Design a protein around this ligand. Sequence first.
Ligand SMILES: COC1=C(OC)C(=O)C(C/C=C(\C)CC/C=C(\C)CC/C=C(\C)CC/C=C(\C)CCC=C(C)C)=C(C)C1=O
Ligand code: SF4
Ligand code: SF4
Ligand code: SF4
Lengths: 134, 199, 64, 267, 286, 262, 157, 150
Amino acid sequence: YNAWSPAQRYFVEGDHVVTAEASRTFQFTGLDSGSFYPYVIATVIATAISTVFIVAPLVIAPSRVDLDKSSAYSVSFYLVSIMYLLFDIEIAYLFPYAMTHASLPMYWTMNLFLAILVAGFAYEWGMGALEWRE
Amino acid sequence: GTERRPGESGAWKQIERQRYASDWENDPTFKRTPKNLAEVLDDSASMLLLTDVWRGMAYTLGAFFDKKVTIMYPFEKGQLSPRFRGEHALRRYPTGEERCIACKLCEAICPAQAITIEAEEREDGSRRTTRYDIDMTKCIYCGFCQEACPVDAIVEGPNFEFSTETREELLYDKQKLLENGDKWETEIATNLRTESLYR
Amino acid sequence: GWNALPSLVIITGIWTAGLFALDKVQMFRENKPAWANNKDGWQKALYRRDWYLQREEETLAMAK
Amino acid sequence: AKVNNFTLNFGPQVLRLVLEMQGEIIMRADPHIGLLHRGTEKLLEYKTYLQGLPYFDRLDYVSMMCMEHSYVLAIEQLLNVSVPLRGQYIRVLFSEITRVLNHLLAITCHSMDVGALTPFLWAFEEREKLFEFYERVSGARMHAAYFRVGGVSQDLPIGLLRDVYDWARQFASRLDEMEELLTGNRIWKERTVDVGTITAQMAWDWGCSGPILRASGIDWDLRKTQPYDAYGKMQFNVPIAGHGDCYDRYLVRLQEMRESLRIIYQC
Amino acid sequence: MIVASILILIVPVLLSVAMFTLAERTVMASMQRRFGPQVSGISGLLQPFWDGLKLGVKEPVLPDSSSAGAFAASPMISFVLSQVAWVGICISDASFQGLVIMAISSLAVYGVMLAGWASNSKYAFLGCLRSVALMVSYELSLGAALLSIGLFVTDGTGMKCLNFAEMPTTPQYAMLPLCLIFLVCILAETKRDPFDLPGYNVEYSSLGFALFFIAEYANMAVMSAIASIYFLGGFSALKITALFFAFVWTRGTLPRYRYDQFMRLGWKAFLPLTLAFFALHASVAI
Amino acid sequence: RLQTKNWSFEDVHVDFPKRLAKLAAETGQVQRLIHFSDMGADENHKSLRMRTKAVGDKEVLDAFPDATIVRPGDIVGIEDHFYNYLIYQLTLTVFAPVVESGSNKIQPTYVLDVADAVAALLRKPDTAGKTLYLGGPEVLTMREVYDLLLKTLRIYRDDTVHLPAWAVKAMYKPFDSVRRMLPGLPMTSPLATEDYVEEMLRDKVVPAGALGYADLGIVPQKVTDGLAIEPVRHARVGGYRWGDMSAVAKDIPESVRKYYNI
Amino acid sequence: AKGLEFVVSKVDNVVNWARAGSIWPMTFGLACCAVEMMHAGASRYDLDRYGIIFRPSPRQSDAMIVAGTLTNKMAPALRKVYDQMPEPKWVVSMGSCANGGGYYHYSYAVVRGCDRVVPVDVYVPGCPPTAEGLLYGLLQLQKKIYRSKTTQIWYKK
Amino acid sequence: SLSGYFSRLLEASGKKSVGSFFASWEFGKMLVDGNLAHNVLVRATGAGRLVGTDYNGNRYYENEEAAYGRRRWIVYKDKFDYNPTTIPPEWHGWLNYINDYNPTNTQFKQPTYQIEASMTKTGTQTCYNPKGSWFSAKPRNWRKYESWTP
Ligand SMILES: COC1=C(OC)C(=O)C(C/C=C(\C)CC/C=C(\C)CC/C=C(\C)CC/C=C(\C)CCC=C(C)C)=C(C)C1=O
Ligand code: SF4
Ligand code: SF4
Ligand code: SF4
């Protein structure tokens, strides 16, 4: 990304700024604060490395064809997956609370939120749904 | 400790039984209910904050700082005795004549039938073998042949390091067994100077 | 035991040397030892203004 | 609903098991055996009585001389042969050494199957010491062929009892440091308590014997009820538990190691 | 400069993974009164390298009854996610860095489930669901622990964040039980003792298998660095080694749980405890 | 099948068989020499390997007059070089070139029949000094072979393309001028050469009046169906597998259905 | 030519150092001989010191140790597990039973040697062999791996 | 004393100087073989004394303050292909803790037919083979009768 307007460049005129931005080094203390751009490069580089790991034993290793070498040697998961989905949504809701300096009415609203959560959880506990016998 | 708890029960029928009936309170191997505050704190410091994992961890950390029992083979060896039953071998007299006289007792006693013997009389009239085979892949290393021999001709020597790459190298004939005896004769005699007090 | 000491020493030395080298490289990229700090919208605005005014000072320097 | 059983094949690699499950709960288990059937009962008909003796070492190859014992006693009874006193004492002493070896292997292999790896490595060095005791009297670490009709094969070498006493002087400490990892541990208890319960009526109806039978509250030891060699002279206790548990069998086996140590010291 | 920084990060990660797997063997041996690898190189210092090179010239088994793309993709996905999580630890300045790493580690479930779907084994399908159930169950306690941690993380300007450079440089004495729960959650995520019952890589050979184990040990190092940042007052080499020694020490001395046992532990013990601690810390933080 | 900077076709098909026949005739105790060549071997062949094979056959029959020359067709098997490379050409490539219309005829045979043929030759004394052609009971074109493989593999997209022979040779030319000064590379197909293109422009069948399997008393097995085609059935999409297995499990006994979870 | 052949010979040296120092066998604990193999892995002899890790699956296995007698009922299963190991692989036959049938050689139920089912690289003799004798056999297998020259053979093809 | 360490290292390795030791191929294999590295650098340079030397050049050491079963060890002269089959039988029972006899304290009776100990020949083509083998100088047909030749 490069800035496309004079207002985006703090009203600095000239052609040196346009070329200097287009050929800039990545800097968290320049124009790229909080940028998440190294996460993409890491994915590309690690995918390259793991592809080289995959391809290389197809060249430098022995191989023999055999028909036997190319052969094989509950509802509780539904409970776990759906409960994890709902609880992950609830934790995602609780995260904006913890990132604020909350006042007391915010605290009591959050505790009403948590109370509804734990009431449903305690109902499923009391009916014997967290006993994984089946 | 070997005490039991309602809840630490590994099964379901006993878990269902302990939470719906107080029959576990009659059994003397169960831990009783805490009666006051300090006993409740002791039980909670047992269940929470572990302290039973930590005793095993302290023992294994003591073992981390302790002595080791590993020997550095093949620069260091184990410990064996003169009675040890290793590789079979054929022996001679000090003159150089074979002790074996083809009596076929070791062939008769062999429970694995690992010995095959043929004989005739030698040109000086002596009674000697012409074939003496031991299938080492059929042998069970019992030592019964060593017991049956009346002239101490066949022995099991002190050699245990004789692994090969082909199985044909483990079908010993008479010449190789005599070569083994000629190799190991002094050690075999040293062993038999002690073991003749017992046999 | 004494056999476990060299691998445990080597892990520490590897991480020490690698963190030292990564620190020097990122210090050469960013030129200030607070590049990893949290920045809000005001701090981001301040850094972007500083970058653009530095470019303007460079542009005005090559005219005299 | 009309739930059919889900079946499973459990291991060619020598026990083969065909299970049936109704979810996570087993409804049936069928062991398929014969992968180690070598026909030793047919082969013994083609051997003389001395020739067929080393077959018995290879039946329970964790406990060899005890397998030899019953074959030798069966021959001696029909022959009307008496064993001298020193041979009876030697047979009792090595039978108890054999029991200690077997119980070390059984408890530590069980605890390794559950997941605890260290007690295996701790107990096998003691197993190595008792293998050296086997080798010093027979020349074989495992398949000794030591017990014979009418006694034992060779005499004890001079210096054996000295070293057996030196091992027995520290074996209780080894068993103590073994129990610090397992006996008061909650994971081991939660794996073993109330698992596979055997009552006394089921134990006798299913032909049980040994430490299974003692963990269900039955006082039955053949060394005290139908004694053989010099076992009637030996003073020891029979350990008794009453749940029929895996945990109770583990405790009974440890106590049986203690009692075998007591008999070894008396011999 | 970003590519250079990432490669200079990648080098000690792989070197450290090799030395971790050697150090696990040797420390586990020293607790068991033996030596461990000593022959292969001087003091055994070449054993992980010869394992890697042995697997390099090993034959790749591609079963001709599976889907080849997902079969190849599963260990690649595991390895890539481990490397990306390390980059998020060291080459980021983001405001919600702990949330970023939690999101990455929630993605790591896919390699297990792709291995379970791809290979045509009866019990690989059976064990992948169990391993996923274990990781999924303990992720929630990890998230609630992060909620408790973030209530006290403020930078200089007054903004609350999960930025690692703004974390305090003293141990968090007030959150010792939450630290213990975090460590057992790390043990549960890496499928170590006492949760090692579920394996899923039963059909993999050579460098796909090597990618699986490099990903597993790198994820263990990621979680160790995260725990040292959150509770031990910073990220350091000594803390990484000490926490790894603690994990190997626990693996030496304990047996493992049954499946339903650790499911009941994670859904009846750890989640209510982390949520109750979050409520107590929110009450304190007002 | 391919040339290398250390070994040429004449070194392997000409010089070594000649020296082998000479050293065999020197001993006096060798009563039989079985030399293997190809069904498409011809001195007037544009493919170099067929020509060097026929030249070496002549040298062997010259130096050892009672040596038997055996010339089988394409040999199918688990570890063969015929279906394996064709399956590696149908899959694992963006497209599979077919030389011209693919109407050249071949006579493939099974490897166990050739192994039986060697023992039948060693039994019969009349076969010394002769030449035998070994081919299966069916004459097929390359298009028919490709169609059979595509039906057997259950692939629903014909990825083959028919190309003129100059285009195929132009494709295979850059990796044939560099085949020397190289020690030989793994996973190089023996079909990626001009010699294969020259072989595809001709028929490779048993000649009329030649001695074949019938003179050895052998009825050769079918190559298209049966046990010979079972290895390629394992490489189909999804897996071999049985099926639903429920129409025939109707009157099967009790424990069997529960064992198979039907 | 001289330099490239020297490099190829050193590639064989490094590859053989890696393969011999990283043998991961598969356990067939059929019988008596398995207990001595357990004793070989224990703290006195410490097979892990030589780089040996026992593996549960055949796909990660570099070698097979047949430790015990092989019956007619067990022979196809052993063959099937052998066929599932990837190249390069070796087989170590341990004890008289696996070597030639041993004490059960004339039985109606026993395979007379595992040679009859799988090919074998190193034979260790005994009934049982000692754990130290099994160490000797494994060091001999390492010596067999050292004499291999794979890239030198490939370079001259 | 480090001078004691280096003197022990030179008498154990059989070299003449530390420069000759560290520039040798024996030190090159001791960088890649850790079993030999431990035996030469740690065990042979530790507490203990030299007992004797056999005719193959191997040196024998003992230490009575060590644990039981780790009192005795050997330094092989063949650094590159060391093998326990080169130990003579008059040292075999001492090193395997079978007896307490060695040539330095016991005069063994030497038979006139005694073959000296050497390294095993397995894996090579000069190994032992039975008389009916292909590798023999003249293979045997083991027929127990004579055929009529006209
Ligand atoms: C009991 O636990 C354990 C296991 O069971 C879970 C195991 O399976 C293993 C064995 C498996 C291993 C070691 C594989 C994983 C590690 C690898 C592949 C090492 C990664 C190292 C790298 C990439 C650096 C090496 C490469 C270099 C130096 C480049 C060389 C280049 C040139 C010379 C040009 C071990 C040790 C173990 O303890
Ligand atoms: S030791 Fe036993 S098996 Fe060996 S030859 Fe003697 S009697 Fe036969
Ligand atoms: S070795 Fe002994 S028992 Fe055997 S035949 Fe010769 S003399 Fe008789
Ligand atoms: S060779 Fe001997 S010790 Fe080994 S399994 Fe067979 S009978 Fe048992």
